Amino acid sequence: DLKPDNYFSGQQLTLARAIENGEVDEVIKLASGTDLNKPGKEDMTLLFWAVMNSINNQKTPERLNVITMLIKAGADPLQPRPQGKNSPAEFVLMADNADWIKAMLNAGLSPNAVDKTFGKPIIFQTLEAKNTKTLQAMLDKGADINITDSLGNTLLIDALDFHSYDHVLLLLERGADPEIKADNGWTMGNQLQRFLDRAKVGSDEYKKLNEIKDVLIQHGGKWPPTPVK
Amino acid sequence: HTSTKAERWQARKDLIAKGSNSLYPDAQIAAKRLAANNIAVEKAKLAENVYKTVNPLEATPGVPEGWKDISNDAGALKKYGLDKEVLFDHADTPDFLARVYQPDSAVFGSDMNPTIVFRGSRQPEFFPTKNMADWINNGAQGLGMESDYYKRAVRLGSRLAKSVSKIDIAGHSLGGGLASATSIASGQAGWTFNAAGLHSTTVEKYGGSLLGEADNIQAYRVEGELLTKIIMPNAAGVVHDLPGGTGGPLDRHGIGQAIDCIEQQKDEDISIIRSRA
C-alpha cells in the first residue's frame, strides 16, 4: 500500500525500488554506492523501508535478507529518528516475532548495543513486546542477561515493573541473577513481595505472581527478600 | 506594576491561616478548601503545560511560574528512579508523554512537591482502524506491536513506589486516566482534572497495581464536562466538583475551564474568610 516515490528520489529511489521488488542481488549491487543513512521524507530511511517491505505476505527469507545486506553495506540499525523517536533495531524489538531482529543480528548488530539518544541498552525494548521471542533472540545471540540501565535496573527488575510476566519467567529460566540490586537498593524480589501483598488471592494475576515466586525459588533465588536498606 | 510569585504565595498562606484561626466555622471550612485549591490549581497549570511539549528532547515553553521542567535533566530525575527514556513512547509521535517538574523552594518553601504530569492522546484509536497510509501505523500493525499507554504508565507507577523522595502525579483528560493509574500503582498522591476513568479491562490486566486505594487522588471536574456527562467508568479518586463552567460539554472539558473554575472557587472562599475579619 506504500509507494517509495513518496519518500525518496534519485539514487535512493532506485535502491528503494529494488527493495520494493525484493531483489537481493540488485540490493547488494546498489547498496555499496548509495547513501544508505540519509533520511527521506516523513523520517523514512532505506532501512525502515526494508522493514516495511518484509511484513505480512512479504515476510520472506529473501526480503528479510535484504535487511541484513543493507546493514552489512553500512545502513545503521541504531540510527535514531528526530525528537527521540527510535531506531529500526529498537522498533523491531517490539515486534511479536523475532524474524526482523534476527536479520539485523545476522549483520553484526551487537546484542549489547545501546541506543544513540539515551544510551540505554536496546534489549530493554523487548519488554514491551507481546511475547518473549525478541528477548529470546537477543539472549540466544549472547546479550548480557544481567545488563543494567543507567539506574542499575536489570531486565528482570524492569520486566516485573512493566508487568511483563512471561519476560520475567524467561529471564529466570535462562539464569538471570535475581539478587542484583538497582541503585535504590531494590531487587526484583522486593517488588514481587509488594505485588503479592497487593494482589487479589485466587485472581489470575495472583496465580501468575506465585508462578514467578515458585520459579525464582526453583532457580535458587532468595525468598522472602531482604528488606530494602 | 507586578509582584513576585513568592510574595503572592506567602500572602495566600497568610490569608489561609486567617481563616483557619478564625472563630467562625465558615471561615475555617473555607480555609481548608482554599488551601487544597491553592495546591490543585498549580497541578492543573502543569497539566495544561504538558500539551505544549513538541520535541520531548527540548524545553517545554511556558512552564508555570515557580516550577522547573526537569524532564531532560537526568541528574535530577534519578532522585525519583526516573530517566529520560521512560517518560514517553518512541515508536511514533508521543501522544503518551510525561513531564516532571520541580518546585522552586524560593517560591513555595517546602509547601510543594515534585510532580510528574501525563498527557494522553487527543483522539484515542483502536489500532486496526488507523490510517494505514501512514507507514509507522502500517509497520506497527505488521509487526504485531502492542498498543497500550497504560503499560508505560503502570511501569512508572511500579518505579515511583520505590522513590525515597515524594513525588505527586497529575494529569488532564486521558492523561488524568494515566495519572490515576500511576498514582494507584505507586501509592503517591494524585491530582486529576476532567480525567478519564480506568476501564475494567485495564484494571484486570494490571491486577492489584490498579486495585483499591484512590483515597489520595483528588479528581477535580468541571460540572457538565464531557466525560462525566457520559463501559465508561468514573474517574478514580475523591471527586471535587467545580461549578462555574461555560458552554457545552466539550468546552467544559478543557483544562483552561478547570483552571478558571478552581480560581472561581478560590475567590469564593477568600471572600468568606475576608467576611470574618
Residue numbers in the entry:
A (entry chain I): 2 to 230
B (entry chain A): 169 to 398, 426 to 472
From the reporting publication:
Here, we show that AGE crosslinking is harnessed to activate an antibacterial phospholipase effector protein deployed by the type VI secretion system of Enterobacter cloacae. Endogenous methylglyoxal reacts with a specific arginine-lysine pair to tether the N- and C-terminal α-helices of the phospholipase domain. Substitutions at these positions abrogate both crosslinking and toxic phospholipase activity, but in vitro enzyme function can be restored with an engineered disulfide that covalently links the N- and C-termini. Thus, AGE crosslinking serves as a bona fide post-translation modification to stabilize phospholipase structure.
To identify the Tle modification, we solved the crystal structure of the His6-lipase•∆ss-Tli complex to 1.75 Å resolution using sulfur single-wavelength anomalous diffraction (S-SAD). The lipase domain adopts an α/β-hydrolase fold with a central 7-strand mixed β-sheet surrounded by 13 α-helices. Residues Ser341, Glu393 and His448 (numbered according to full-length Tle) comprise the lipase catalytic triad, with Ser341 projecting from a classical nucleophilic ‘elbow’ that connects β4 to α7. The lipase-immunity protein interface is extensive (~3,900 Å2), corresponding to 14.9% of lipase domain and 17.1% of ∆ss-Tli surface area. The inner helical layer (α8, α10 and α12) of the immunity protein solenoid accounts for most of the contacts with the lipase, though the long loop connecting the 2nd and 3rd ankyrin repeats also forms several hydrogen bonds. Strikingly, lipase helix α6 is pulled away from the main body of the domain through interactions with ∆ss-Tli. Surprisingly, Tle appears to adopt an activated conformation when bound to Tli, because the lipase catalytic triad is exposed to solvent in the crystal structure. The crystal structure also reveals an unusual interaction between the positively charged sidechains of lipase residues Arg180 from helix α1 and Lys461 in helix α13. Fo-Fc difference maps show continuous electron density between these sidechains, suggesting that the residues are covalently linked. The +36 Da mass shift observed in the modified lipase domain is consistent with a methylglyoxal-derived imidazolium crosslink (MODIC), and MODIC fits well into the electron density bridging Arg180 and Lys461.
